[PDB]
Symmetry: D3
Subunit: 243 residues, 6 copies
């Protein structure tokens, strides 16, 4: 009761004896339960606020799965506390809204780099510092994805703090013209804070919004997005077990 | 199944028929369950990611209780979708870390104004726009609090995107000298975005960190913080049922 | 001659033995003469540049009346020197140009908060710090105004350094859409610098420009504006004598 | 009564039939009365708030003398309205605080350029735009000053919105090291806004503060500053009558 | 004479018939002459200001070699005009000053990402946009370098506009603590502008300054730097001929 | 060989025994060869990258001529190293693109002031610091130019880091309306860094682009630009030999 408040990190509620060097983070707590279905020797570590934390084993490698909620500030809390617990490699398995016409629902966006349009990373360092993915991780992600059939795109995503501003339309058109593939709320914060803490970082995003329907299409789309999530999780697991 | 995706807001997962004009928001999903214990005719509306949404009745007035997770971006999603559902008055019942020496754990900080050091509100409008609480709400909060015994402080809080930067020490000392009472991650975003959407807004914060112990003190402190949370919730409920 | 340069503040030209804790500031030197007509035991304290300084008594309370000229920099000089002389409560009785259609000439705008679009407050502190009015003062201002017949509006004003830029039209439309009630040159500087110096602060503004005429209307409008000024001064005096 | 509000500029309260193309501006209203003592055919044009406006004749040339109060915002109002009245050449006769050790009281600083650390000019144009004095005017100012005995310095001044910030000490040392000669509140705004409105502009500043005393020295210093003011006014008058 | 001004790009002085899709850029004109010594079928294309442009063949692939002078603005001119001439892959072979202790002269820094502390890229796009190297190119650079003996480092470099500011010491220590490997003047501009123009981009830097000597050591150091340059050029050539 | 690396500045490759107090800088290395044709006792000092450095004598005065390449960063390197070598007066003889309709090719723009829209000067000091030309130098430049027939214009130029951005059209129209005479890449950096290093600075620009043709006109235009360059060089030489 008291020894836990002493030993555990205050938000993710785990310690260095529990956290693997290899970690997958995702925004949605329920996604953690889905991801561990792909793994053996699964155990619940902690549940606190938006932070749901499990360990599992994939091809002999222990990997920690951690939800972080929506947005840079909740991601950054997780990244810092995971680092304190001995994390060394962190892959985000997330969702994105497409910023280019021909990206279908359930297709994947692999963030090589990210526009730092969220405030969280800016608390740490000038915006001029690059948010980009680790080469070692991208190499394995590429090797895995090129050997299957679902379409995927490597490039730049935009991370931001709100899609509900009255300028959303203007922003979407501007960023589309700059060749941004998709938008999320967290990738740039993982890339910036993680790199500064010496972590290897990457981000694999399931497309869940078209750039721009009946019950049948609705069901088909849901299945496509579920398939994309599964592919993203598998790609991350395959990448991390090879480290 | 399909009609819900049509009718419900995509994150808080409720509609205009469900949401009261009067709303309490909090960061912690489990706090919603604690708050509704103070209310009658309670019903679960939605549970999605960090958004846990209930209705209850307090002295004849229906009030919606909504968790929002940690950080401005998740708060802003909630504020926007609540507005779309017909919210008119929103009070944050939250936690803060004290920025002045003599603020004890479980004492309350009522945010008259907030430093906009989070990125979320900046997506909407120049930082020069004031984050401040609605007079109508502050009047009722003051009237209630002055008639009880727990210490409370009206003034400025700082809202930010990270307490884990290497400059945290420098920031704390700077802001202490400027007379800031406490820090959180969300108040300024509620105040800025809410006011811009025409909402009456306020924020009542339970102090959960001293500016600067045995098992006994640990238990005493936990009780004090629980008492402070309860007081904050009651103050918000008393304020909203009088609108 | 020499002892005065030693004892008096260098711009307002008064000392701590002269200044009341309770102060009204206004931009126009001649307005001071008009305000003291409402007061007893009136005495001229100092006249220097745009700073015209008088004491008077209103319902048994001594209150200092001080002009400050146009603009944040001249206001800030006054605020700092008044603070040094022992001021504790300062109310601005000023003029504004309306930023909403239905605000008539001589109606009052009570600034709950202010957009810090002037440079003066920015010299002191990041623009993210809120410019807002003190609750204690707003409560008394509201109580007084609700008991009379002239229309008044509580909300946000914009303070700025120039209404003569070629973008004035664009600014007016932008700020109108954001729900700003009116514009002046000084309120945000009083609110920011005053709060930082530990002063209770408020601002009551007479509307002197429509958002958007014969000799008869011209005379009627002048009378309306004079009536509004008188009401603003009375409201400030009633508020301060009750402290 | 009504025709005046139609014809006169709203702050300086004069029209195009009254204002000379050649104008001296100063902060202090009482300085206008002192300056016109050096001139013939003097007439009071207007008195409104901090704006005291006179015409006089110096060596056959009619020149308008206009006070502007303290600070960029009140200066800018004057510059804009003078421009509207047909001003073409404007010289500031002002005061400065020295930022270098060996500048004595009553010695003159001629601003070749100015640091735009005031908000007023920033309302008009990016800070990257240069605040500098007109060559035609500097040539005549130099020609006049080199032919007399009081020490004077050509170079950069800093214009700002407050000398009362808690960082004043840090600012003074920083700017001293950058070779700034002196500080005022208005020069950069005249230079920036005036140049943008197509005016020839210059600024001659009487030093009134040492960078860093008995009744005797106090009197001697006052005389020195009065002599410096007189020299500055004469230099401006000699320059403008030669245009 | 006249047809050339019509057909050739105005600074690099070549056209689309001359430029290969595959290009090496370097700052030093004389480095171009050294690089082409490694190539067959070499021809001088143009010589204009700091832009010295040659074609050569390396393992059957035609590659253009182009000097760009020092600094982002001259680099950006080259990138834009090369793009207009049909460039698709551009590798910078440059020099850097080390920002970490154990990087020896003539060891290589491969820029995965770059801090955009130069103004050139900022003319195009918000600093929040990432300056990073293309995965396809990094994969080949890594594959080549891991198969030889000279030490090399993948990571972040800082690109800037001056190493001669009085804050150079403070900057070096700050950036060293952030884990930056080395500094140059151009990499971030190539990465930002090149990516925006749809180019594949990379940067291989020869270390020419220790983070922190007799005639013998001087000669040894010069040889080491020459060997490093040669290695960098070979790596770029090997990478591009495989595209 | 080794003593040179010890004694010479690392980019301009000259020392204090070689550099005159009086210096002309230009962007184009080949322009140095053209300028020295106007001079006696000419000697090549150094050739390194874009830096071509010669001494010559003009009417008994030794003057150093130094090319600097394109852009602020390469200019700033030259300014700093020239200062270290004992330079005291530096005049830029450069090219500009006209920003006003009636400025013909080969007419001269004398920069009184410059918009600091390049990053190089910003590395040194806040953009609010003025980039302007030295009075002593402008006086002599004016005296010389008024006594000949080629049209010339004194006023503001804009210095920037790229003319190839997609906003070039918008920028040109904006700056044209603000009365900017012409644009280059270096003037503001010379003015800012040079003034901070205590140098007397000026800039004389040959117009080489109309704001907005057959072989005959092409040849006529080339001659006009050559004549303008010659005039600019002569003006600089006449100015410096009189110091
Ligand atoms: O359990 C599955 O095989 C599965 C099937 C469908 C969707 C899934 C999504 C995940 O994130 C993980 C696993 C799945
Ligand atoms: O259920 C309670 O009475 C209670 C008791 C203790 C702590 C509480 C905190 C809340 O937010 C709400 C209610 C309580
Ligand atoms: O003297 C008055 O009663 C009066 C009458 C009319 C306008 C006034 C304006 C003031 O600011 C103060 C007083 C008045
Ligand atoms: O009236 C004077 O001769 C005089 C004498 C002394 C100081 C002065 C200052 C001024 O600005 C103008 C004139 C004077
Ligand atoms: O010519 C060489 O083999 C050589 C030898 C030494 C250094 C070199 C540097 C280069 O950039 C290219 C080639 C070399
Ligand atoms: O050599 C010349 O007389 C000459 C003739 C034509 C153009 C010139 C340009 C220069 O920069 C310098 C000299 C000239």
């Amino acid at each position: 009761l008291y020894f836990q408040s002493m030993s555990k990190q205050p938000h993710i509620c785990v310690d260095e004896n529990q956290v693997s060097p290899y970690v997958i983070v995702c925004g949605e707590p329920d996604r953690v339960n889905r991801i561990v279905e792909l793994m053996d020797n699964v155990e619940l570590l902690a549940e606190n606020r938006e932070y749901r934390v499990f360990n599992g084993v994939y091809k002999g490698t222990t990997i920690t799965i951690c939800s972080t909620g929506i947005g840079a500030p909740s991601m950054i809390i997780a990244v810092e506390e995971l680092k304190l617990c001995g994390a060394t490699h962190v892959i985000r398995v997330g969702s994105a809204g497409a910023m280019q016409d021909h990206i279908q629902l359930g297709e994947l966006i692999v963030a090589e780099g990210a526009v730092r349009d969220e405030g969280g990373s800016k608390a740490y360092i000038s915006s001029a510092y690059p948010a980009y993915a680790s080469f070692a991780l991208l190499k394995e992600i590429s090797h895995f994805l090129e050997n299957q059939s679902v379409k995927y795109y490597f490039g730049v995503v935009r991370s931001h703090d709100s899609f509900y501003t009255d300028e959303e339309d203007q922003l979407c058109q501007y960023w589309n013209k700059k060749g941004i593939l998709g938008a999320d709320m967290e990738t740039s914060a993982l890339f910036t804070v993680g790199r500064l803490r010496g972590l290897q970082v990457a981000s694999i995003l399931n497309n869940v919004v078209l750039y721009q329907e009946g019950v049948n299409q609705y069901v088909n789309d849901n299945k496509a997005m579920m398939n994309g999530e599964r592919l993203a999780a598998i790609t991350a697991l395959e990448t991390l077990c090879k480290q």
